[PDB]
C-alpha cells in the first residue's frame, strides 16, 4: 500500500512480508461497508447522477481485481506473493547487472525500463511453463 | 507504418488443430476471456457472470488455479466408441464437443459428488494419529 514507493527494490521486499501491506484486506473491509444496504433502505430513492457513477465505479472494482487474480491464476502462482518460475531471464531484456536492479533502483523507474518488454514476458511464462508443466505432470501420472 | 508476422500463436488459433497440438495452446484462450447507451454495461456483467461459473466449477472439482488436472473418475467406454489414438491425434475440439454434448451433465455430477466430495470426508478423517 505504497508505503515504500521511494524505497529500493532490495529493501522493499523486507516490508512486503505484511500482506502487500494488507492490500486486499482493505477491499473486504471496504465492501463490507460499501455494501451498507442504505442503498436498499432507499432504492436510491430515484436513479441519480451519483448512482450512475457508483455503478460504473463498482464494475472497475470488479474487473481490475479479476485481471490480477487471473494472471496470477494462470501463472501457477495463485494466491501467493513471491513465487519463482522456470523462465530464464534473457539479458536482451535488461543489460543492467544484479545489484543495480535491487540495491540501487526504485520501482516506478524499473517499470519504464521494461514496459516495452512486459508483454513478451507474459506469454513467455504461460506457454513456456504453465502450459508446459501440466502436460509433463500428466505424463508422470500415466504410469 | 508497422508490421511483422506471427510469433507465438493467435486467438482461437488452434481451433482447427488436433488435441495434441491444441493442448499446448490453452493460455491464449485463457487470458482474453475476461478483458477484451447502457448496453455496454449489460455486456460487462454477462462477461463476468460467465467467467465466475467456469471458475466456480473448477473450484469444486479440486482443480482451481491449474489449467489441466486429473481426477480419479473412471472414463466409461459407453460414452465414447472412439479409439484412443484417434482422439489425441485426429479429432479437433470443435467436433469433440458435439459428440459428448449429451453426456456432459452426467460427467459434472460424477466429478463432485463422486470424488471431490468423497475426497474430503476421507481427507478430514485421516487425522487422529
Amino acid at each position, epitope marked *: 500500500f505504497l508505503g515504500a514507493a521511494g524505497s529500493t527494490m532490495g529493501a522493499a521486499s523486507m516490508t512486503l512480508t505484511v500482506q502487500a501491506r494488507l492490500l486486499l484486506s482493505g477491499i473486504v473491509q471496504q465492501q463490507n461497508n460499501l455494501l451498507r444496504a442504505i442503498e436498499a433502505q432507499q432504492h436510491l430513492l430515484q436513479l441519480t447522477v451519483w448512482g450512475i457513477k457508483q455503478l460504473q465505479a463498482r464494475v472497475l472494482a470488479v474487473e481490475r481485481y479479476l485481471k490480477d487474480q487471473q494472471l496470477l491464476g494462470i501463472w501457477g502462482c495463485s494466491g501467493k506473493l513471491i513465487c519463482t518460475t522456470a523462465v530464464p531471464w534473457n539479458t536482451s531484456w535488461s543489460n543492467k547487472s544484479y545489484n543495480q536492479i535491487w540495491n540501487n533502483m526504485t520501482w516506478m523507474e524499473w517499470e519504464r525500463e521494461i514496459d*516495452n518488454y512486459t508483454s*513478451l514476458i507474459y*506469454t513467455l511464462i504461460e506457454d513456456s511453463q504453465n502450459q508446459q508443466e501440466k502436460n509433463e505432470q500428466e505424463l508422470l501420472e500415466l504410469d | *507504418a508497422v508490421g*511483422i508476422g506471427a*510469433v*507465438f500463436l*493467435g486467438f482461437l488459433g488452434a481451433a482447427g488443430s488436433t488435441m495434441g497440438a491444441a493442448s499446448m495452446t490453452l493460455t491464449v484462450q485463457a487470458r482474453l476471456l475476461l478483458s477484451g447507451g447502457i448496453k455496454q454495461l449489460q455486456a460487462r456483467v454477462l462477461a463476468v457472470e460467465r467467467y465466475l461459473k467456469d471458475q466456480q466449477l473448477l473450484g469444486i472439482w479440486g482443480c482451481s488455479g491449474k489449467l489441466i488436472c486429473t481426477t480419479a473418475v473412471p472414463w466409461n467406454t459407453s460414452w465414447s466408441n472412439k479409439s484412443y489414438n484417434q482422439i489425441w491425434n485426429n479429432m479437433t475440439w470443435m467436433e469433440w464437443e458435439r459428440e459428448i454434448d449429451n453426456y456432459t451433465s452426467l460427467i459434472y455430477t460424477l466429478i463432485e459428488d463422486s470424488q471431490n466430495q468423497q475426497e474430503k470426508n476421507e481427507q478430514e478423517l485421516l487425522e487422529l494419529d
Partner: antibody
Amino acid sequence: VQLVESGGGVVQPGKSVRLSCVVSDFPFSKYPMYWVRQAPGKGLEWVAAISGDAWHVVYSNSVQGRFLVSRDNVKNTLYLEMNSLKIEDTAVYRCARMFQESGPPRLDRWSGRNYYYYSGMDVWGQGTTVTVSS
Amino acid sequence: IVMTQTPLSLSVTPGQPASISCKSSESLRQSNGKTSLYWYRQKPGQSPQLLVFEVSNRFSGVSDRFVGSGSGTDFTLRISRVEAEDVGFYYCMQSKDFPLTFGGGTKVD
C-alpha cells in the same frame, strides 16, 4: 553526427558491389536505418530499411530480391550489397538515419506477431555514387 | 500509395509570403494519433536537411516563419515572408507504409 559511405564507383551490368556506411556516435543498435536513391535530375526513390535488431528488412519492389542490406551493431557499420545491376540503377545512394528513436518489437496480445515501427529520416549521409555502363 | 504535389516552379524574390501544398491520394492518419507526413528541403548539390518532421512540430535550426497544416488528405506547407536563401527543392515525404514515396520536389527560384 558524422555520416558518410564508401565503396562507390562505376561497374558493368551483371556485377555486384557492396557499399559501407559508417556512423559515428549515437547508439547504433537502438536505431533503424534506410536507403534512398536520388536519380540525377529526378526526385527521390526509397530503397530499403532494416530494423534496429537487424531482424526486419523491407525492400522496394523494383529492386526486390536483387540487393542486400545488413547491420553490425558492434562495428557500427551499414552495408548495401547489390546484385544483377542495370544501367538505370545509376544514381546517388544515401545512407540515412531515422528521425525518431524506435523501440523493441511490440507483440500484440491477440495474435502472436511482433511489430517493428518505422518512421522517416533526418540525417542523410552525403553518399557515394554507382554507375552501371560499358 | 500515390502522393504528388504542386506547383513545380515558384521563381520568386524575397519579401512576400507563399505556400506549397502536397496532395494525398491515400489519407494519412496512423493509429498512434499522428499523420506521418515529413516536409524537408535539399539544396542543389547537397544531401537534404529536415525542415519540419511533423506537420505540426519543427526541427532545430529552423526559422519561425515555416508553418504547416492539413487534413488527412489535404496537406499544406506555408512559408511566411519567403527568405532569400529559399532556393533548391522542397520534397513532401510521407511515412504511412511501404514503399513510402515522395513528391517531385518543388523548385523555388
